[PDB]
Design an enzyme around this catalytic site. Structure first.
Site, PDB file in Angstrom:
ATOM      1  N   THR A   1       0.848  -1.183   0.000  1.00 41.82           N
ATOM      2  CA  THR A   1       0.000   0.000   0.000  1.00 41.82           C
ATOM      3  C   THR A   1       0.885   1.236   0.000  1.00 41.82           C
ATOM      4  OG1 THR A   1      -1.546   1.306   1.324  1.00 41.82           O
ATOM      5  CG2 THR A   1      -0.225  -0.358   2.480  1.00 41.82           C
ATOM      6  N   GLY A   2       0.564   2.183  -0.871  1.00 44.04           N
ATOM      7  CA  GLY A   2       1.423   3.318  -1.110  1.00 44.04           C
ATOM      8  C   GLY A   2       0.664   4.557  -1.518  1.00 44.04           C
ATOM      9  N   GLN A   3       1.414   5.551  -2.010  1.00 52.66           N
ATOM     10  CA  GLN A   3       0.846   6.859  -2.318  1.00 52.66           C
ATOM     11  C   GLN A   3      -0.275   6.774  -3.341  1.00 52.66           C
ATOM     12  OE1 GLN A   3       4.020   9.268  -4.155  1.00 52.66           O
ATOM     13  NE2 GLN A   3       5.000   7.352  -4.800  1.00 52.66           N
TER      14      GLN A   3
ATOM     15  N   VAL B   1      -1.930  -2.421  -4.152  1.00 54.10           N
ATOM     16  CA  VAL B   1      -1.660  -3.379  -5.225  1.00 54.10           C
ATOM     17  C   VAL B   1      -1.775  -4.792  -4.676  1.00 54.10           C
ATOM     18  CG1 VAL B   1      -0.060  -4.158  -6.998  1.00 54.10           C
ATOM     19  CG2 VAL B   1      -0.161  -1.736  -6.356  1.00 54.10           C
TER      20      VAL B   1
ATOM     21  N   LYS C   1      -3.972  -3.037  -9.395  1.00 58.67           N
ATOM     22  CA  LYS C   1      -3.611  -1.778  -8.754  1.00 58.67           C
ATOM     23  C   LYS C   1      -4.893  -1.008  -8.475  1.00 58.67           C
ATOM     24  CE  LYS C   1       0.071   0.004 -10.960  1.00 58.67           C
ATOM     25  NZ  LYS C   1       1.564  -0.055 -11.216  1.00 58.67           N
TER      26      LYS C   1
ATOM     27  N   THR D   1      -2.352  -5.187 -14.607  1.00 59.04           N
ATOM     28  CA  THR D   1      -1.056  -5.166 -15.277  1.00 59.04           C
ATOM     29  C   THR D   1      -0.350  -6.505 -15.090  1.00 59.04           C
ATOM     30  OG1 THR D   1       0.394  -4.381 -13.470  1.00 59.04           O
ATOM     31  CG2 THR D   1      -0.884  -2.706 -14.659  1.00 59.04           C
TER      32      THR D   1
ATOM     33  N   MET E   1       4.905  -9.025 -11.564  1.00 58.47           N
ATOM     34  CA  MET E   1       6.368  -9.036 -11.565  1.00 58.47           C
ATOM     35  C   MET E   1       6.830  -9.574 -10.210  1.00 58.47           C
ATOM     36  SD  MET E   1       7.207  -7.889 -14.589  1.00 58.47           S
ATOM     37  CE  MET E   1       8.835  -7.182 -14.392  1.00 58.47           C
TER      38      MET E   1
ATOM     39  N   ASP F   1       9.063   9.946 -15.539  1.00 59.91           N
ATOM     40  CA  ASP F   1       9.615   9.735 -14.196  1.00 59.91           C
ATOM     41  C   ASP F   1      10.456   8.460 -14.153  1.00 59.91           C
ATOM     42  OD1 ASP F   1      10.259  10.152 -11.521  1.00 59.91           O
ATOM     43  OD2 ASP F   1       8.326   9.503 -10.759  1.00 59.91           O
TER      44      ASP F   1
ATOM     45  N   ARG G   1      12.960   3.121  -8.927  1.00 61.55           N
ATOM     46  CA  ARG G   1      11.717   2.906  -8.189  1.00 61.55           C
ATOM     47  C   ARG G   1      10.531   2.645  -9.114  1.00 61.55           C
ATOM     48  NH1 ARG G   1      13.092   8.159  -7.846  1.00 61.55           N
ATOM     49  NH2 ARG G   1      11.863   9.460  -9.278  1.00 61.55           N
ATOM     50  N   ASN G   2      10.653   2.973 -10.398  1.00 65.02           N
ATOM     51  CA  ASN G   2       9.601   2.735 -11.383  1.00 65.02           C
ATOM     52  C   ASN G   2       9.968   1.625 -12.360  1.00 65.02           C
ATOM     53  OD1 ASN G   2       7.745   4.580 -10.338  1.00 65.02           O
ATOM     54  ND2 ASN G   2       8.746   6.321 -11.380  1.00 65.02           N
TER      55      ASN G   2
ATOM     56  N   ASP H   1       4.778   2.105 -14.914  1.00 61.15           N
ATOM     57  CA  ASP H   1       4.141   3.401 -14.623  1.00 61.15           C
ATOM     58  C   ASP H   1       4.622   4.507 -15.569  1.00 61.15           C
ATOM     59  OD1 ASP H   1       2.497   2.369 -12.529  1.00 61.15           O
ATOM     60  OD2 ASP H   1       3.868   3.011 -10.959  1.00 61.15           O
TER      61      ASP H   1
ATOM     62  N   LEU I   1       2.694   7.960 -16.047  1.00 61.33           N
ATOM     63  CA  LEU I   1       1.683   8.099 -15.004  1.00 61.33           C
ATOM     64  C   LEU I   1       1.700   9.469 -14.341  1.00 61.33           C
ATOM     65  CD1 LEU I   1      -0.496   6.797 -13.190  1.00 61.33           C
ATOM     66  CD2 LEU I   1       1.359   5.971 -11.708  1.00 61.33           C
TER      67      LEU I   1
HETATM   68  C1  LIG Z   1       5.130  -4.487  -5.619  1.00 64.93           C
HETATM   69  N1  LIG Z   1       4.701  -4.081  -6.942  1.00 64.93           N
HETATM   70  C2  LIG Z   1       4.383  -4.987  -7.895  1.00 64.93           C
HETATM   71  N2  LIG Z   1       4.721  -6.260  -7.616  1.00 64.93           N
HETATM   72  C3  LIG Z   1       4.470  -7.206  -8.527  1.00 64.93           C
HETATM   73  N3  LIG Z   1       3.912  -7.080  -9.726  1.00 64.93           N
HETATM   74  C4  LIG Z   1       3.585  -5.809 -10.014  1.00 64.93           C
HETATM   75  N4  LIG Z   1       2.991  -5.367 -11.158  1.00 64.93           N
HETATM   76  C5  LIG Z   1       2.797  -4.008 -11.047  1.00 64.93           C
HETATM   77  C6  LIG Z   1       3.263  -3.566  -9.846  1.00 64.93           C
HETATM   78  C7  LIG Z   1       3.783  -4.704  -9.151  1.00 64.93           C
HETATM   79  C8  LIG Z   1       4.725  -2.622  -7.185  1.00 64.93           C
HETATM   80  C9  LIG Z   1       6.006  -2.015  -6.610  1.00 64.93           C
HETATM   81  C10 LIG Z   1       6.302  -0.579  -6.989  1.00 64.93           C
HETATM   82  C11 LIG Z   1       5.773   0.436  -6.006  1.00 64.93           C
HETATM   83  C12 LIG Z   1       4.334   0.162  -5.608  1.00 64.93           C
HETATM   84  N5  LIG Z   1       3.590  -0.519  -6.676  1.00 64.93           N
HETATM   85  C13 LIG Z   1       3.034   0.137  -7.711  1.00 64.93           C
HETATM   86  O1  LIG Z   1       2.573  -0.440  -8.694  1.00 64.93           O
HETATM   87  C14 LIG Z   1       3.001   1.661  -7.635  1.00 64.93           C
HETATM   88  N6  LIG Z   1       2.253   2.269  -8.705  1.00 64.93           N
HETATM   89  C15 LIG Z   1       0.902   2.377  -8.704  1.00 64.93           C
HETATM   90  C16 LIG Z   1       0.149   1.802  -7.682  1.00 64.93           C
HETATM   91  C17 LIG Z   1      -1.226   1.947  -7.719  1.00 64.93           C
HETATM   92 CL1  LIG Z   1      -2.189   1.219  -6.469  1.00 64.93          CL
HETATM   93  C18 LIG Z   1      -1.873   2.640  -8.722  1.00 64.93           C
HETATM   94  C19 LIG Z   1      -1.088   3.211  -9.704  1.00 64.93           C
HETATM   95 CL2  LIG Z   1      -1.867   4.094 -10.979  1.00 64.93          CL
HETATM   96  C20 LIG Z   1       0.285   3.092  -9.723  1.00 64.93           C
HETATM   97  C21 LIG Z   1       3.494  -1.978  -6.566  1.00 64.93           C
END
Ligand SMILES: CN(c1ncnc2[nH]ccc12)[C@@H]1CCCCN(C(=O)CNc2cc(Cl)cc(Cl)c2)C1
Length: 266
Positions: A19-21, A25, A39, A83, A86, A130, A134-135, A148, A151
């Site tokens: 959970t983040g800004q 997810v 997400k 999405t 990963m 960006d 981190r992205n 992202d 975004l």
């Molecule tokens: C742990 N993560 C994953 N793990 C595994 N698979 C994956 N696919 C996509 C993300 C992902 C991400 C790690 C990066 C930082 C946090 N995060 C994000 O996707 C942040 N961006 C975002 C979040 C929301 Cl809720 C809505 C919008 Cl528009 C954009 C989750």
């Protein structure tokens, strides 16, 4: 349901991923079989009508090293973005896990992964806006993919919108910091910083500086310097991304050729 719209009833939720800004997810399955990330966009964080319209356009972006957009769920609140999953998470965290004991060959492959995705975006005249470790995300095979992209255009938080206490000063070229001049070449600048992050195993760029001191450092024409793990040839590539004159920075196609050349030379 339009072609960009996924039925949320086709989703099974399996695990919390953070959970983040921007919201929550989760890991899950689509139609009982296919791994997805779901997400769940934090209410109030996004320009939602603009985001939904742009999601239609971005359904047409697809590359092996770009995190794949599968669709959106907009008939309810919060809206979902579906999405590619990963499994190894955020690249920055991955780089900082010292147990991996990375070889420099693995680090260069991570740079190539990102460079291939950015070359594809550039061929589509699409800016990330960006780009940073981190992205990026890492899958269960250790492949890095860009996440992202674009975004930031829909993020309402003003501290993140402008050179703003959450703006990516450390990934920005002088013409962004001085004039807000975004272009392909500000993505090139950020990519060079991203290479630096990779070869520094997730160190903060300009680690000893504030954002304000970093901008001043850039203003005076000073730069990051060579990570211990970067060869001279690798450093030359990341350094080429930081030319004061945007027009003298390379393209992603040229960066990709340079990175492949160094991989062969090892
Ligand atoms: C742990 N993560 C994953 N793990 C595994 N698979 C994956 N696919 C996509 C993300 C992902 C991400 C790690 C990066 C930082 C946090 N995060 C994000 O996707 C942040 N961006 C975002 C979040 C929301 Cl809720 C809505 C919008 Cl528009 C954009 C989750």
């Amino acid at each position: 349901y339009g072609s960009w719209e996924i039925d949320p009833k086709d989703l099974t939720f399996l695990k919390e991923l953070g959970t983040g800004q921007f919201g929550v997810v989760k890991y899950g399955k689509w139609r009982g079989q296919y791994d997805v990330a779901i997400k769940m966009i934090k209410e109030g964080s996004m320009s939602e009508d603009e985001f939904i319209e742009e999601a239609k356009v971005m359904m047409n972006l697809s590359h092996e090293k770009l995190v794949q957009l599968y669709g959106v769920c907009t008939k309810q609140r919060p809206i979902f973005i579906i999405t590619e999953y990963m499994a190894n998470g955020c690249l920055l965290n991955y780089l900082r896990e010292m147990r991996h004991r990375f070889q420099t060959q693995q680090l260069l492959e991570m740079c190539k992964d990102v460079c291939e995705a950015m070359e594809y975006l550039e061929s589509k005249q699409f800016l990330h806006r960006d780009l940073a470790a981190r992205n990026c995300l890492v899958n269960d095979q250790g492949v890095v993919k860009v996440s992202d992209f674009g975004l930031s255009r829909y993020v309402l938080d003003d501290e993140y919108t402008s050179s703003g206490s959450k703006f990516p000063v450390r990934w920005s070229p002088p013409e962004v910091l001085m004039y807000s001049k975004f272009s392909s070449k500000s993505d090139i600048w950020a990519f060079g910083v991203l290479m630096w992050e990779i070869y520094s195993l997730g160190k903060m760029p300009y680690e000893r500086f504030t954002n304000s001191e970093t901008a001043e450092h850039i203003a005076q024409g000073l730069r990051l310097y060579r990570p211990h793990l970067a060869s001279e040839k690798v450093y030359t590539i990341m350094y080429s991304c930081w030319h004061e004159k945007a027009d003298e920075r390379p393209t992603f196609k040229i960066l990709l050729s340079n990175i492949l050349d160094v991989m062969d030379e090892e």
